[model samples]
Target: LTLTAAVIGDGAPANGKTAITVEFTVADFEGKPLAGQEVVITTNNGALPNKITEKTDANGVARIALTNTTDGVTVVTAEVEGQRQSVDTHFVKGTIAADKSTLAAVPTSIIADGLMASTITLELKDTYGDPQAGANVAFDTTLGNMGVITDHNDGTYSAPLTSTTLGVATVTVKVDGAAFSVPSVTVNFTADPIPDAGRSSFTVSTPDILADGTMSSTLSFVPVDKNGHFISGMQGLSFTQNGVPVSISPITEQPDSYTATVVGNSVGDVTITPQVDTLILSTLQKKISLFPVPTLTGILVNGQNFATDKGFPKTIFKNATFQLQMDNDVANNTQYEWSSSFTPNVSVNDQGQVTITYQTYSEVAVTAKSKKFPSYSVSYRFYPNRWIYDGGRSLVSSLEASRQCQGSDMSAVLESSRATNGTRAPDGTLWGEWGSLTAYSSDWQSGEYWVKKTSTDFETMNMDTGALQPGPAYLAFPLCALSI
Candidate 1:
């Protein structure tokens, strides 16, 4: 018996083969055909055919059918009358079939202008529904640029596709195998539309309080589809106020959202609109008003309006301690700076309290400034210890002169009386009591006082006689004297 086996079509059989045809010829030892010979075919694995018995034909040839059971090499033997012959064949699992190819896209939506591309994917599987790896795939698109397919070695293939046009785009993927040539799978994608201001949602926000000069607000815009989902690839939009075009700062940080800055240099009602191409979106009206800055109108002393009355009695007292207040309390009380022009005249503190010390009669400008609003300030004129001094001139006896000068207009006198020794002291050092002028004489001289040296400048009173020579002392009277 002789045995010969050849694969049916290709070099190797496909996976999980159960039926195979093998031809055998039985002959005599003399090389002559042996007729009516029984032949049996066996394999290493799988059940043998039920009708494995076959008789040799008239031409000394017998055809037997065989089946393989496993995926490894399959050994088969055909035997007749103690003569044995064997053949070795291989069987393996099949690769992915054509109909099982499926196509998909990563992004599913394509953005126009190539800002971002969509990734197309094709998955391949074997005949046994197992993943088929290491297969080459071809990728093509109907309306965009497509990249070469990349094999993931895990039965997944991907490629990049991009387009500038806005419409539906089709991508087709074909595997390299002959069975996958026809009916390639296709994936559909929709390109994002160009940005439309009229079809977008916008939000405008300003500070709760705004000033007129150099203030800004923020604007956020989201370009979207009819479904309200965010879409990429929108050319920046333009801004306008009151039908006049205005420039806005473009968004730099976020990709899906567009933002801009709205700046106002003057205070008014501003109607702002966002525009793209030829369409303008809804208008945002913002009314900007200036909040009053914290200002100090004037300084207050002991419930008196020192700014209005610079001649208040307490203002002229020496080293007068008083509480000061602003003409109007500021809105932000903590944001104020208080100061005084003349340190010797008065001292000011942050709380608007001040102390007026005895200084030459002068006007002190007390100022209150706003820390937040630098331009706002208020000033008040204050008089501290204002007084006139008359010295080195003889007008009359200290008591006589003091008594004569007593009037509603006379605030005080340096001295109402001299010491019993009849000597004079320095002008400002010898001050009498504050309100002792009411008992003064009524007759008063009113002219500039002057003194001329006399032969004897001292005058003495006789103790018993109470008479003094008055010619030794000369005196003159003045209405208004220069202040020291």
Candidate 2:
């Protein structure tokens, strides 16, 4: 039998320590594929397992792997059925390069006792500059912890360096067991100094005048080095307002600034101070004056029947009395000027006691103000006049008849003007004069009854003794009336 061997496809790739697979096929001289035939592989310049033997697959093919071999053309000997053949395959050396020439910390600096890590990466390639994967790299650092390198599986290898001290750190990376013209690469980085009271400043600000006893304010602190660059990764800041300690939440999201909250209570003159571990950074003093806010809590009616359970006056009769209630603190501090929305409806005294008169039948508002504090005042609504019904004939009252002008929350009786002093006969004959109780002509046009007119009006008549007439008559009274 004639034996032959050849590398499958493009010859396998090698990166020194990494294994490369080579496939070989066996067939008789007549070119017929051989199956289930035992084949052995031996590499002259590469590492292969002892007694390495593989049987040709159904397609007359066998594969073997080699690793940690010398770099050059490899002579692989294949033997099958006492037939020997040799083939050549190349083992290439890989090259290494970095994305950045100099390794730098991510934050560019590290504080004392504040750990920070930086990543150093190297791209691996074969002799032809084509990406070569599964390459091992050895990393070393002079000033920090450098763990074992990790393969990213994308033609790149990375190792992390972490430390917590100031000064420059030197990092180096080398491809393991690969000979190359370019030596191993080196990078240098730096660690920054921590922040302290001497490197920080703070400021505080609040509204000068507060209307009430409480107000919200903000305090800001900034830390920087001599170069005016923001310092990072430092803590322990203390804040106080009016000698009382206040909490400031550190703003790590920003590289250099910190802020705190200051709430002013019983405001007189507030003082804000910021410190770093008992070392005062800055002090800010400001004035937050507090004044009384006058408010109209309630308007109380004088009579028990007009007052609500809460001592507030809701309803009042004609010419009733009411008292304007205010905060006790406001009442003791200043005098109030009184005014009325409906001038003729209500009147007020110098002492904020109101004597309301029944000028009109509607609701009106009365307000009290302090001249010293223009924004301080109170207002209340009042109904001056109560409705009272007159027991007279509907025709004798005004068009819009009511005992008193209509006011809010007042009870009264309302009647329609549909009733009149006229009467209708069986044939709809004539009636007496509208709204009159006297007799017709010389007679006492009495017994006047209401009669609806054809023109939407009611007619007054004494009797229907005459023939009925389709005629028009007008009444001079309102359609509605109210009685209280």
Candidate 3:
């Protein structure tokens, strides 16, 4: 009996399961094919063919298909009457498989910072999941730029990837083998956006508040993103100083911009920032200033230094003239709006001209305020009493009726006197005793006023508003002096 076995194909590839075809042919001693021959086939590890198929066909050949999921080598033997043939199938186990390699990006999400890039690593693994050193590696991307690839020589290849655009990048890695090729896998890289503080731009209508308070100014700017791209849509926003909560209302549908307007009260520096849910988006250079609140420091009463606090006692000859002046550098820069507390009774114009017709001390005050800087203003309350200095009037009476002073006692005009004369005056009017009391005084006590009586050669006594009524038969207040 003669049996020859031929191995068709190796059914094993590394550590996986595969199938092989084994063929056996039997012949008689005279070299003539013998039919109906029984062939016994054995394998290292397998479920042999059924009893019916163990017998050779009429052509004297037995074909058997064997299967195994093993590593190393697989041996199969075909025997007939002690005439045997053995076949060994060496499986390619632990050999590198290109398709089994992996590609990974260190950071799946990348912020589009100054340099928008991420590190990518490629691991080449075999059928046994072991690292393989096959240098035939190639990479390609549908988007973005790929830096030079590096080989760690330990089955790992790495490369740096830069985002050319602000969106996503697709990378395809391929490994070529000697016999065949590995499957191409993809590593998608994504690029994100961020606010670029340095690239920000801010615009302001005017740095100064001008001559107007209770007025506002506008501010504007365009926001920039990290990739040197201009972007918008920063939902919610706010900026503040005096708690006005300045609005980021964009003008003309500007992108990530604002037109902030606020009235000036006191001195201040109002700054703002853009935000999305409390995030201070950009730290870019900003230009926002809230001018300091000016004050009513000095008054140019008829072009004299009669500050509201000055008790110099200005004489309203016909009427008067005044001007509003601030203590700061902005004083001269402002235009004034002049008015009188008692209109119609007392009138004033923007040119500082004034008129006082009432002599009853009905709050005859003249006001001057900045036309542009409304926050800066001043008022002077003065009486319309005709006045005269030491002229033998030291002992006099009836001056009110005689001197065109429309007369009243000194106490009556105290209201108009104390107010415009400044805080230097006491709350209540003061006076000397009921007789020739102090040095031939210029003060006439607290108020710069005097009254006269007709009883005695005109020698009058001084007293506060508390009395002035019962002290004399006919008493009159002095008129404030006037020249022209």
Candidate 4:
């Protein structure tokens, strides 16, 4: 027995069915025709046009046909008198439910960063729910492009799609010259808007900032476009001090912006920068900076606790360094501006250093002013003498002058200076007593300034008189001394 197929492939027509034919031949061992042999036929998925049992003709041939709607090769079997044969017929899909086919994808959304992708599934099927294996497939989408589509050959196809544009992406799928139903997907986000160097801004929420760790201003960064409109997708932002002088807390990532707390580590200007990933960001505020104020308790001149109540002392030219006593980070951050009227032995610097400094006429002052707090300053006044304006008296008695000159504070003038008109006396006065002892003067008329006028009368005279005066009268001049 032998079997053979008539058609290898045939298209299913609009009616969703097609036909295939096969013939079977039988013969005896002597090649004699089997004139009255009966044949039985079988098939997997199709109907036989002729009866399953058939009688062979005079030439010993049994011919039959199969009808099928499903795609792919169909197998048929024939059996007779201890003999069997089989044949296969191929069929092309002739009709499909295009609208019923599905073009599906997982993950309904994809980032428009041009990096991520979504998987699209293409399912092709016929009205009878049969898979079409050899259908011509095509695809396109509003998304930028798709990877190569994979044919599962089981009524299913798939591809990966990526986008560079934001918003919804429309996809179209075509199978065997017929378009299938499709669902649109979303491109969540794409290329972001550029931050304008002139529009992006770094701003502070607080009015003032101090060096104290607890005193800070909330610094916020908002990015804008060329039009200066704050954008929404500016979340990948960070802030930095950029080597400026300041202390900053960790950055806070808000919904649409970034923020951090900033304080002045030291007084003066500090600049901070905003950035996205690797690119340094720009803004009009980027060109600007923040300045911190100093918190100070007092200003000191050479760290000395000088008496503020005295008249200018007769100080010689000397160097001094002024310091600012700060309530916070003053010692390191505060700046001083030293100023003094042009005078002999005096030169003030911005660093609060003075050279051979002294207060000249009209009470010259070497003042060190705090730049952080201009209102607070420490001044070194160069006074010519120390005098007490007591009891409505411009002049104090000799004993009182001696008493006033004796103190743990300072000494009276040791010798005459430019202050005393060649005598250690208060200005406009005739005499002053020396704090030191001196030799006696033998000549009474030589009484320059009461050097123990060597007279039996014990009379004393200031340097103002070349003549001797009796002890009975005017020894009433106050004592004075030159501050050494």
Best model number under lDDT: 4
TM-score of model 1 relative to the true fold? 0.36
Candidate 3 TM-score to native: 0.40
C-alpha lDDT score of every prediction, in listed order: 0.51, 0.49, 0.52, 0.53
Which regions of candidate 4 are displaced past 4 Å?
1-51, 54-67, 70-99, 106-118, 126-130, 162-170, 175-179, 186-211, 214-251, 254-259, 262-334, 337-484
Instruction: Give TM-scores for every candidate, taking all chains together and pairing residue i with residue i.
Output: 0.36, 0.33, 0.40, 0.37
Tens digit of per-residue lDDT, candidate 3, span 1-484: 7887778877455333356778888988777777888888777744233222478888788877765434567777887887878888765545666567777776765554536567777787887676755467666766667788788877888887776455566666765623324443343433233446677565666655632355566666566665665555444544433322343444433645655654555455555554434546446434455554445565443323444554323333222233445553224433666677776656665455555433334336666676655656666666544323222233235444234332334322222232222222222222211121122244344322343333222222233333333334354434233221
Q: Over the stretch 61-141, how does candidate 4's per-residue lDDT look in tens digits? A: 777666765556667778888777777666665456765577776667665656678787877777766667666787777
Of candidates 4 and 1, the better by lDDT: 4
Candidate No. with top TM-score:
3
Instruction: Please tell me which model should have the higher lDDT, number 2 or number 3.
Output: 3
lDDT of 1 at 454: 26
Report how far off residue 104 is in candidate 4 (Å).
2.6
lDDT, model 2, position 137: 66
Least well predicted 10-residue stretch by lDDT in candidate 3: 428-437
